[PDB]
Design a protein around this nucleic acid. Structure first.
Ligand SMILES: [Zn+2]
Ligand SMILES: [Zn+2]
Ligand SMILES: [Zn+2]
Length: 85
DNA sequence: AGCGTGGGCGT
DNA sequence: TACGCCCACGC
């Protein structure tokens, strides 16, 4: 991990330079992406994409066992587990 | 439950 | 450099 965060209070290191640039945003407070609907700003594009689903009601991921739908894959993953117990 | 949000990393 | 995934933690 050749890329260390320069903020003295922080000590995060990364493998690629782009990971450092993305991380740096938590320190600069920069949020490049804005929701066309509610105007809220976000630090990342992928998080804006999933956030928008809260407005549209879009749920692309369904449970293979019960068919319950979710807006995010990690929500589906957390849910499928319950069918074990 | 619903969802913000950082980290890793393939491409 | 950027997108967009999985992943995971936190409330
Ligand atoms: Zn930092
Ligand atoms: Zn919004
Ligand atoms: Zn299910």
């Amino acid at each position: 991990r050749p890329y260390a965060c320069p903020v003295e209070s922080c000590d995060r290191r990364f493998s690629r330079s782009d990971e450092l640039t993305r991380h740096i945003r938590i320190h600069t407070g920069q949020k490049p992406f804005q929701c066309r609907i509610c105007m809220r700003n976000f630090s990342r594009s992928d998080h804006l994409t999933t956030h928008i689903r809260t407005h549209t009601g879009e749920k692309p991921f369904a449970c293979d066992i019960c068919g319950r739908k979710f807006a995010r894959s990690d929500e589906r993953k957390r849910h499928t587990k319950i069918h074990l117990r």
